[PDB]
Amino acid sequence: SLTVKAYLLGKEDAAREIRRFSFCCSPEPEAEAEAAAGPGPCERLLSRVAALFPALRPGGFQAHYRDEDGDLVAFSSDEELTMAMSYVKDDIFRIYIKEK
Amino acid sequence: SLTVKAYLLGKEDAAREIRRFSFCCSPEPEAEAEAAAGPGPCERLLSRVAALFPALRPGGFQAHYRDEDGDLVAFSSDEELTMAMSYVKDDIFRIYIKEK
Amino acid sequence: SLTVKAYLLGKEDAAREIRRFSFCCSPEPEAEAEAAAGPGPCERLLSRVAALFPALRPGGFQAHYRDEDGDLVAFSSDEELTMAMSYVKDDIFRIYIKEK
Amino acid sequence: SLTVKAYLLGKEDAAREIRRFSFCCSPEPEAEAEAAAGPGPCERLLSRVAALFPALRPGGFQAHYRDEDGDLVAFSSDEELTMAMSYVKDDIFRIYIKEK
Amino acid sequence: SLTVKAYLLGKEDAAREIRRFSFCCSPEPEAEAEAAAGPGPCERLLSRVAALFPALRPGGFQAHYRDEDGDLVAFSSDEELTMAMSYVKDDIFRIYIKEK
Amino acid sequence: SLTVKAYLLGKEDAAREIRRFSFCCSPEPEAEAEAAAGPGPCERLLSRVAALFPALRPGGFQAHYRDEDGDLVAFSSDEELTMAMSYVKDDIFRIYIKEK
Amino acid sequence: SLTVKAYLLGKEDAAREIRRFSFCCSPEPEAEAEAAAGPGPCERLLSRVAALFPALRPGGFQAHYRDEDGDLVAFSSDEELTMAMSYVKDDIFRIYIKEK
Amino acid sequence: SLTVKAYLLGKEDAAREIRRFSFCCSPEPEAEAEAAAGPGPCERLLSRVAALFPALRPGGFQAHYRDEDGDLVAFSSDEELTMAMSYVKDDIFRIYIKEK
Amino acid sequence: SLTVKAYLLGKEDAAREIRRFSFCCSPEPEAEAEAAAGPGPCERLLSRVAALFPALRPGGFQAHYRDEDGDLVAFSSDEELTMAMSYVKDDIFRIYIKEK
Amino acid sequence: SLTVKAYLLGKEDAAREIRRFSFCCSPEPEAEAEAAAGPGPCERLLSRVAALFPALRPGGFQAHYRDEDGDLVAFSSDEELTMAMSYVKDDIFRIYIKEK
Amino acid sequence: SLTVKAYLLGKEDAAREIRRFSFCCSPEPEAEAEAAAGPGPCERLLSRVAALFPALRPGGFQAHYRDEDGDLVAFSSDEELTMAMSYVKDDIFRIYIKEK
């Protein structure tokens, strides 16, 4: 299991709302194309953040993760998630949520 | 139940009058053609706003709702109402009333 | 018993006069059509505010009550009164009186 | 699905009315010549904008879309629509409606 | 039994009112759909906090609980309650009440 | 018998006035609905504090009692009184009186 | 492997969006003219920045890299890339993305 | 029930050992002369203090209780115990144990 | 399960060594006289503290627990343990170990 | 793998030397009694700290780990190690080394 | 090639002398036991620092490297060097030299 921490950013980049959800270490929830048609972790995470942060649009936001440099990188692909977890050594995945 | 908030706009787009009414989560009040002859939610809402905002014409106004972008979209169809509620996560439906 | 507080608003929305009256928890003062011909609480309240606030017209004013959002909603129906009291938990009903 | 945003322009090129409609990602609604006799997306869009913007003529208007440069290009062909969508990366197609 | 401590937060995030209630270790008060139609602990807690904190709206507030990091996470689901109790080792469940 | 000590709090939460009254260990003074219509200890205590602390409103105050944590919990129910006495081992019930 | 960091510049030369991608130390992805018809690294990088920075045009931007002096040099040739990497000693290639 | 706290005093009247035992509010444990032959509370208390404070003699000590003045009064009679409890209002009986 | 925290006291009553062990909520480990011949929790705890605190004698020490007053009470009976746990609300039992 | 961080403490409890070693998540290095004769993790860790901290005795030191309270608990048993790791969520095990 | 930067520390942990040397990416300079009899990188580095920092003893010093936490870890084994380089992403290995 891997708890993912999300940080909501308003206009002054100030923490509006905080919420976390339990995630599986598994690559993807489903295997069939009826349930995985390419993505998996990204589409899963972006789903929870939507229901968790109703303050903004359901799918009208980008999640930005810090890199080795610290800069924000708006991720939106499973390939980018596998990389983002490579940074964190612990079982906590922090990310910066922003509404488009 | 779903409370619908209406905002009256004069000439300077300034809030003239504020009023709310309790609405049902149901699709339509009646089923017979004697009582539903196509519309339902739109005709119902537009009815209340008229009696609630006597300051203007009874049926000589358009209700504009914000979209995902924020822009105003003068709705006047049930199909447009079902969509407008899809935006709001809460049980409060805000709309911008304007007299023609 | 339920004390109703009224706030008179001039031109600058400034408290002109303040006055309160004792009201009954009962639905309506009378039952016969000779004394209740539809309304009850609204017609009763609007009656007192008139005699209490002679500064303006007797029946040429609208009483606006705050909602869950805080916005003003010019009430003028018994059905709207029962709802307005649902907001206040205490035995004090505050309202914003304005002359038309 | 693809929401198309339209902007009405008066005399001072000022936003008169705003309205949006849900569109299909599909090439055309119908395949038979009885229902597609050459056009498809253009004729479909121009149909909605007419019913949506009754303020002007039903078919006496031209829809202008921004290009790579930003300039307005009055489109009126399906071949031009497929190209216009190539600009927008998102699922929102903005266009400038003008009455002839 | 499990005593739940709630902390009311005004505008300056200062403790407005403090109140506690005795809760059952049981999963849910009732089993029938007439009495449990999905939720249980969340709907129960949120019910008490409403009657306990009349200072704000009855159901117009979000309860935020500290996580392993300490950040506030506005919970509103039974699945989130079972997790929140997993943090506290004692028989005291602290939470931060905020009115919407 | 059980002596109840009350502490009056001004603006600086400073002890304005101190007064005590002898109470009965009994559940309620009366049994008939003409004399007990639900409450008993709360309504009894709140009655004395009013006559004892005329400095403020008769029934426009809340009595807050310390819990196991020490925090103040504005009680106003008999069910809450039976619990408050469970804390004190002695025959002295201390409480913090505050005018609304 | 070599991570390339890109910096998006608006109108005030302020960092709009940040995103990184993993690159190969290899000269070119493919060798055949069907896949390398002259360029290689430039065309590859400019491809990613496009998909990564959809905020602007797909191929309507120039990437500027700092020199020994620090000044910006809009590169757009493989010969210029091999040189740009000669500056950085680490495995991180920073560049300034600007939309034309 | 009544918890009795005992304080052991060495040579410098310093608290050597602390220990408490649960006592009954009842006058005497037994009624028959085979079990009550005059004393009751004194003989009972002095019994526990012996087993509790083995540091000194089993029955070679005197228990001194504070009076209204505060001075120590070596009690050793049931008649003296009933009086000693009359001082304490709470359910805690403190006494000063000293070995002869 | 119940973790018991022990505090070693030298000559200056300063924490020499700290160590904890997991205990069972059960009354006693065994039931037969071959394994319970009267005691149970006391003999069990005093056993662990010995092996845990080899700094002093194996069975030449007394464990003192705080009471309602805070004073130290050298316990050495199962009847005293059941009482000591009645103080702590949590699942942590703190005690002051001293070598005789 | 699990990196264990050790902190050397002189006379003023000041960090004398810092050193870390890579450990296996496995229960024990060996299974045979020739290589595991009861202990495993404790004997393994205490072995490394000795070779790593030659400043003091090889086996004349105690490693103290923080608990839930924060206090130091001189561990020296495998059963105590499994518990110490239960505190840390990450893959880093910190401990306070002290020479006897 | 890999340049190793060393920092000399006096009494006030102030940078006394700075010096760097070019190192090989290779595991060890020699393979024969006449030239590698176990160590390699450590013995090589410690050799240069000696000739480079004649201010102190030739082999009477310890080199401390920062970890993931930042704390100093006096390394003196090849196994520790391979790990220290794993931290630095660049081709620069910084270390804190201290004379024993």
Side-chain angles (χ1 to χ4, degrees):
Chain A
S1 308
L2 301 173
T3 328
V4 182
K5 305 186 68 164
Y7 298 97
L8 218 185
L9 315 178
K11 182 275 161 174
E12 305 75 29
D13 297 298
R16 276 193 171 194
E17 194 67 82
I18 306 303
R19 208 65 173 293
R20 298 158 63 197
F21 68 88
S22 58
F23 192 75
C24 277
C25 187
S26 285
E28 294 180 40
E30 195 75 82
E32 55 182 70
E34 181 292 327
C42 185
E43 179 180 21
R44 275 273 77 201
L45 166 58
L46 295 180
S47 273
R48 312 310 297 181
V49 181
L52 297 173
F53 298 100
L56 58 99
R57 286 165 70 196
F61 76 99
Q62 264 298 142
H64 307 78
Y65 76 98
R66 63 151 196 64
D67 286 16
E68 55 188 76
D69 296 305
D71 294 35
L72 282 176
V73 183
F75 75 88
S76 54
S77 301
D78 63 280
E79 70 76 42
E80 207 160 334
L81 278 301
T82 193
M83 210 90 299
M85 293 189 151
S86 190
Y87 296 87
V88 62
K89 204 76 167 301
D90 308 277
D91 54 82
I92 306 175
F93 184 45
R94 292 81 170 194
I95 54 174
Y96 292 74
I97 309 305
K98 270 201 162 199
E99 55 129 287
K100 303 199 303 174
Chain B
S1 308
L2 301 173
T3 328
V4 182
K5 305 187 68 164
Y7 298 96
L8 218 185
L9 315 178
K11 182 275 161 174
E12 305 75 29
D13 297 298
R16 276 193 171 194
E17 194 67 82
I18 306 303
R19 208 65 173 293
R20 298 158 63 197
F21 68 88
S22 58
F23 192 75
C24 277
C25 187
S26 285
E28 294 180 40
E30 195 75 82
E32 55 182 70
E34 181 292 327
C42 185
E43 179 180 21
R44 275 273 77 201
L45 166 58
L46 295 180
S47 273
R48 312 310 297 181
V49 181
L52 297 173
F53 298 100
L56 58 99
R57 286 165 70 196
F61 76 99
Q62 264 298 142
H64 307 78
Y65 76 98
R66 63 151 196 64
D67 286 16
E68 55 188 76
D69 296 305
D71 294 35
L72 282 176
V73 183
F75 75 88
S76 54
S77 301
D78 63 280
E79 70 76 42
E80 207 160 334
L81 278 301
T82 193
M83 210 90 299
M85 293 189 151
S86 190
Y87 296 87
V88 62
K89 204 76 167 301
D90 308 277
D91 54 82
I92 306 175
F93 184 45
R94 292 81 170 194
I95 54 174
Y96 292 74
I97 309 305
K98 270 201 162 199
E99 55 129 287
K100 303 199 303 174
Chain C
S1 308
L2 301 173
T3 328
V4 182
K5 305 187 68 164
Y7 298 96
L8 218 185
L9 315 178
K11 182 275 161 174
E12 305 75 29
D13 297 298
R16 276 193 171 194
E17 194 67 82
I18 306 303
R19 208 65 173 293
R20 298 158 63 197
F21 68 88
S22 58
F23 192 75
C24 277
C25 187
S26 285
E28 294 180 40
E30 195 75 82
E32 55 182 70
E34 181 292 327
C42 185
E43 179 180 21
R44 275 273 77 201
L45 166 58
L46 295 180
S47 273
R48 312 310 297 181
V49 181
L52 297 173
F53 298 100
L56 58 99
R57 286 165 70 196
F61 76 99
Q62 264 298 142
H64 307 78
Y65 76 98
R66 63 151 196 64
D67 286 16
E68 55 188 76
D69 296 305
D71 294 35
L72 282 176
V73 183
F75 75 88
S76 54
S77 301
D78 63 280
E79 70 76 42
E80 207 160 334
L81 278 301
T82 193
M83 210 90 299
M85 293 189 151
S86 190
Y87 296 87
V88 62
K89 204 76 167 301
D90 308 277
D91 54 82
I92 306 175
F93 184 45
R94 292 81 170 194
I95 54 174
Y96 292 74
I97 309 305
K98 270 201 162 199
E99 55 129 287
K100 303 199 303 174
Chain D
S1 308
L2 301 173
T3 328
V4 182
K5 305 187 68 164
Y7 298 96
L8 218 185
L9 315 178
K11 182 275 161 174
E12 305 75 29
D13 297 298
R16 276 193 171 194
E17 194 67 82
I18 306 303
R19 208 65 173 293
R20 298 158 63 197
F21 68 88
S22 58
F23 192 75
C24 277
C25 187
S26 285
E28 294 180 40
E30 195 75 82
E32 55 182 70
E34 181 292 327
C42 185
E43 179 180 21
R44 275 273 77 201
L45 166 58
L46 295 180
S47 273
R48 312 310 297 181
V49 181
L52 297 173
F53 298 100
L56 58 99
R57 286 165 70 196
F61 76 99
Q62 264 298 142
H64 307 78
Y65 76 98
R66 63 151 196 64
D67 286 16
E68 55 188 76
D69 296 305
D71 294 35
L72 282 176
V73 183
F75 75 88
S76 54
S77 301
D78 63 280
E79 70 76 42
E80 207 160 334
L81 278 301
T82 193
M83 210 90 299
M85 293 189 151
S86 190
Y87 296 87
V88 62
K89 204 76 167 301
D90 308 277
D91 54 82
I92 306 175
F93 184 45
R94 292 81 170 194
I95 54 174
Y96 292 74
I97 309 305
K98 270 201 162 199
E99 55 129 287
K100 303 199 303 174
Chain E
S1 308
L2 301 173
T3 328
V4 182
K5 305 186 68 164
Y7 298 97
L8 218 185
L9 315 178
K11 182 275 161 174
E12 305 75 29
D13 297 298
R16 276 193 171 194
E17 194 67 82
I18 306 303
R19 208 65 173 293
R20 298 158 63 197
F21 68 88
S22 58
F23 192 75
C24 277
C25 187
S26 285
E28 294 180 40
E30 195 75 82
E32 55 182 70
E34 181 292 327
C42 185
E43 179 180 21
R44 275 273 77 201
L45 166 58
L46 295 180
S47 273
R48 312 310 297 181
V49 181
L52 297 173
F53 298 100
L56 58 99
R57 286 165 70 196
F61 76 99
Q62 264 298 142
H64 307 77
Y65 76 98
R66 63 151 196 64
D67 286 16
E68 55 188 76
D69 296 305
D71 294 35
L72 282 176
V73 183
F75 75 88
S76 54
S77 301
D78 63 280
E79 70 76 42
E80 207 160 334
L81 278 301
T82 193
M83 210 90 299
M85 293 189 151
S86 190
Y87 296 87
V88 62
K89 204 76 167 301
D90 308 277
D91 54 82
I92 306 175
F93 184 45
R94 292 81 170 194
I95 54 174
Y96 292 74
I97 309 305
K98 270 201 162 199
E99 55 129 287
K100 303 199 303 174
Chain F
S1 308
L2 301 173
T3 328
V4 182
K5 305 186 68 164
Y7 298 97
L8 218 185
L9 315 178
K11 182 275 161 174
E12 305 75 29
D13 297 298
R16 276 193 171 194
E17 194 67 82
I18 306 303
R19 208 65 173 293
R20 298 158 63 197
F21 68 88
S22 58
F23 192 75
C24 277
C25 187
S26 285
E28 294 180 40
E30 195 75 82
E32 55 182 70
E34 181 292 327
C42 185
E43 179 180 21
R44 275 273 77 201
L45 166 58
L46 295 180
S47 273
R48 312 310 297 181
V49 181
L52 297 173
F53 298 100
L56 58 99
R57 286 165 70 196
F61 76 99
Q62 264 298 142
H64 307 77
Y65 76 98
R66 63 151 196 64
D67 286 16
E68 55 188 76
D69 296 305
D71 294 35
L72 282 176
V73 183
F75 75 88
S76 54
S77 301
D78 63 280
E79 70 76 42
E80 207 160 334
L81 278 301
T82 193
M83 210 90 299
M85 293 189 151
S86 190
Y87 296 87
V88 62
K89 204 76 167 301
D90 308 277
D91 54 82
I92 306 175
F93 184 45
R94 292 81 170 194
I95 54 174
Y96 292 74
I97 309 305
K98 270 201 162 199
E99 55 129 287
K100 303 199 303 174
Chain G
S1 308
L2 301 173
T3 328
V4 182
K5 305 186 68 164
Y7 298 97
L8 218 185
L9 315 178
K11 182 275 161 174
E12 305 75 29
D13 297 298
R16 276 193 171 194
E17 194 67 82
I18 306 303
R19 208 65 173 293
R20 298 158 63 197
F21 68 88
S22 58
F23 192 75
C24 277
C25 187
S26 285
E28 294 180 40
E30 195 75 82
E32 55 182 70
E34 181 292 327
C42 185
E43 179 180 21
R44 275 273 77 201
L45 166 58
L46 295 180
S47 273
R48 312 310 297 181
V49 181
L52 297 173
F53 298 100
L56 58 99
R57 286 165 70 196
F61 76 99
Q62 264 298 142
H64 307 77
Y65 76 98
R66 63 151 196 64
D67 286 16
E68 55 188 76
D69 296 305
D71 294 35
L72 282 176
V73 183
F75 75 88
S76 54
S77 301
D78 63 280
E79 70 76 42
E80 207 160 334
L81 278 301
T82 193
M83 210 90 299
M85 293 189 151
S86 190
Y87 296 87
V88 62
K89 204 76 167 301
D90 308 277
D91 54 82
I92 306 175
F93 184 45
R94 292 81 170 194
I95 54 174
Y96 292 74
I97 309 305
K98 270 201 162 199
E99 55 129 287
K100 303 199 303 174
Chain H
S1 308
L2 301 173
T3 328
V4 182
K5 305 186 68 164
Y7 298 97
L8 218 185
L9 315 178
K11 182 275 161 174
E12 305 75 29
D13 297 298
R16 276 193 171 194
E17 194 67 82
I18 306 303
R19 208 65 173 293
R20 298 158 63 197
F21 68 88
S22 58
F23 192 75
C24 277
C25 187
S26 285
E28 294 180 40
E30 195 75 82
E32 55 182 70
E34 181 292 327
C42 185
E43 179 180 21
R44 275 273 78 201
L45 166 58
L46 295 180
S47 273
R48 312 310 297 181
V49 181
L52 297 173
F53 298 100
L56 58 99
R57 286 165 70 196
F61 76 99
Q62 264 298 142
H64 307 78
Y65 76 98
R66 63 151 196 64
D67 286 16
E68 55 188 76
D69 296 305
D71 294 35
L72 282 176
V73 183
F75 75 88
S76 54
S77 301
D78 63 280
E79 70 76 42
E80 207 160 334
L81 278 301
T82 193
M83 210 90 299
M85 293 189 151
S86 190
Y87 296 87
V88 62
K89 204 76 167 301
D90 308 277
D91 54 82
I92 306 175
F93 184 45
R94 292 81 170 194
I95 54 174
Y96 292 74
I97 309 305
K98 270 201 162 199
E99 55 129 287
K100 303 199 303 174
Chain I
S1 308
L2 301 173
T3 328
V4 182
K5 305 186 68 164
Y7 298 97
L8 218 185
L9 315 178
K11 182 275 161 174
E12 305 75 29
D13 297 298
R16 276 193 171 194
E17 194 67 82
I18 306 303
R19 208 65 173 293
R20 298 158 63 197
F21 68 88
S22 58
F23 192 75
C24 277
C25 187
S26 285
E28 294 180 40
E30 195 75 82
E32 55 182 70
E34 181 292 327
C42 185
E43 179 180 21
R44 275 273 78 201
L45 166 58
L46 295 180
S47 273
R48 312 310 297 181
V49 181
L52 297 173
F53 298 100
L56 58 99
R57 286 165 70 196
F61 76 99
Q62 264 298 142
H64 307 78
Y65 76 98
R66 63 151 196 64
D67 286 16
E68 55 188 76
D69 296 305
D71 294 35
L72 282 176
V73 183
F75 75 88
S76 54
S77 301
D78 63 280
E79 70 76 42
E80 207 160 334
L81 278 301
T82 193
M83 210 90 299
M85 293 189 151
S86 190
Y87 296 87
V88 62
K89 204 76 167 301
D90 308 277
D91 54 82
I92 306 175
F93 184 45
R94 292 81 170 194
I95 54 174
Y96 292 74
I97 309 305
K98 270 201 162 199
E99 55 129 287
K100 303 199 303 174
Chain J
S1 308
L2 301 173
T3 328
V4 182
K5 305 186 68 164
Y7 298 97
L8 218 185
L9 315 178
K11 182 275 161 174
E12 305 75 29
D13 297 298
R16 276 193 171 194
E17 194 67 82
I18 306 303
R19 208 65 173 293
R20 298 158 63 197
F21 68 88
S22 58
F23 192 75
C24 277
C25 187
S26 285
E28 294 180 40
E30 195 75 82
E32 55 182 70
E34 181 292 327
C42 185
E43 179 180 21
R44 275 273 78 201
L45 166 58
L46 295 180
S47 273
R48 312 310 297 181
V49 181
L52 297 173
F53 298 100
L56 58 99
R57 286 165 70 196
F61 76 99
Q62 264 298 142
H64 307 78
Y65 76 98
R66 63 151 196 64
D67 286 16
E68 55 188 76
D69 296 305
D71 294 35
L72 282 176
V73 183
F75 75 88
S76 54
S77 301
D78 63 280
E79 70 76 42
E80 207 160 334
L81 278 301
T82 193
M83 210 90 299
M85 293 189 151
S86 190
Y87 296 87
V88 62
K89 204 76 167 301
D90 308 277
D91 54 82
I92 306 175
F93 184 45
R94 292 81 170 194
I95 54 174
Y96 292 74
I97 309 305
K98 270 201 162 199
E99 55 129 287
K100 303 199 303 174
Chain K
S1 308
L2 301 173
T3 328
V4 182
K5 305 186 68 164
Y7 298 97
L8 218 185
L9 315 178
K11 182 275 161 174
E12 305 75 29
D13 297 298
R16 276 193 171 194
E17 194 67 82
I18 306 303
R19 208 65 173 293
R20 298 158 63 197
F21 68 88
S22 58
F23 192 75
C24 277
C25 187
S26 285
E28 294 180 40
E30 195 75 82
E32 55 182 70
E34 181 292 327
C42 185
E43 179 180 21
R44 275 273 78 201
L45 166 58
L46 295 180
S47 273
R48 312 310 297 181
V49 181
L52 297 173
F53 298 100
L56 58 99
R57 286 165 70 196
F61 76 99
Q62 264 298 142
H64 307 78
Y65 76 98
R66 63 151 196 64
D67 286 16
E68 55 188 76
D69 296 305
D71 294 35
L72 282 176
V73 183
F75 75 88
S76 54
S77 301
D78 63 280
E79 70 76 42
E80 207 160 334
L81 278 301
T82 193
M83 210 90 299
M85 293 189 151
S86 190
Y87 296 87
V88 62
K89 204 76 167 301
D90 308 277
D91 54 82
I92 306 175
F93 184 45
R94 292 81 170 194
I95 54 174
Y96 292 74
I97 309 305
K98 270 201 162 199
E99 55 129 287
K100 303 199 303 174

